[PDB]
């Protein structure tokens, strides 16, 4: 079964553990292209009582740089916030826990805002169908295909 972090049947503990960035998308492509601060490769999620410990690494010249973010629950169900290159809030619009997870993030910095959407998998790659379901959700958010980058081939160190 599938669920939304904002839904009533959400079991946050089940997203604990290993994850991999499969696809990233944004209405500001520069944020996710090479050297962008948001071209983030998720490695693991440690679920706590009121927060999520997210372990990522960014890459440059194929050299991996580790970085962690601690996301705290906000006043709205299913949403977390975290300070990183500005102020961010995010939810998990859809996940089946054991294979894929789709996240939707909003960043606000120095008066500007942009959306970041990601498809993460328990394995380093996911099927065609889930990737297209993700492009459909991006569309619902106003993000077109030219702003959707498949990183499944570049997610290893």
UniProtKB/Swiss-Prot annotation:
InterPro entries in UniProt: Calycin, Lipocalin, Lipocalin_CS, Lipocln_cytosolic_FA-bd_dom, Maj_urinary
The disulfide bridges present are 64-157
Domain of life, per lineage: Eukaryota
Q: Name one GO biological process term.
A: positive regulation of glucose metabolic process
The alphabetized UniProt keywords are: Disulfide bond, Pheromone-binding, Secreted, Signal, Transport
Major localization listed first in the record, in broad terms: secreted
What compartments host this protein? Answer: Secreted
Summarize tissue expression: Abundant in the urine of adult male mice but absent from that of females.
Xref: CDD domains: lipocalin_MUP-like
Signal in keyword set: yes
- Which GO-annotated molecular functions does the record name? insulin receptor activity; pheromone activity; pheromone binding; small molecule binding
PANTHER family (alphabetical)? LIPOCALIN, MAJOR URINARY PROTEIN 1-RELATED
Purpose: Binds pheromones that are released from drying urine of males. These pheromones affect the sexual behavior of females.
What name does the UniProt record give this protein?
Major urinary protein 1
């Amino acid at each position: 079964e599938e669920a939304s972090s904002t839904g009533r049947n959400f079991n946050v503990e089940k997203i604990n553990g290993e994850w991999h960035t499969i696809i990233l998308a944004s209405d500001k492509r520069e944020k996710i292209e090479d050297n962008g601060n948001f071209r983030l490769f998720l490695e693991q999620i440690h679920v706590l009582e009121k927060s999520l410990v997210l372990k990522f690494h960014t890459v440059r010249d194929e050299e991996c740089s580790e970085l962690s973010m601690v996301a705290d629950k906000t006043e709205k169900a299913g949403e977390y916030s975290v300070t990183y290159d500005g102020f961010n809030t995010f939810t998990i619009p859809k996940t089946d826990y054991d294979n894929f997870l789709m996240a939707h993030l909003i960043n606000e910095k120095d008066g500007e805002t942009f959306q970041l959407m990601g498809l993460f998998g328990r394995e380093p790659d996911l099927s065609s169908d889930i990737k297209e379901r993700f492009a459909q959700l991006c569309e619902e958010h106003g993000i077109l295909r030219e702003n959707i980058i498949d990183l499944s081939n570049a997610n290893r160190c």
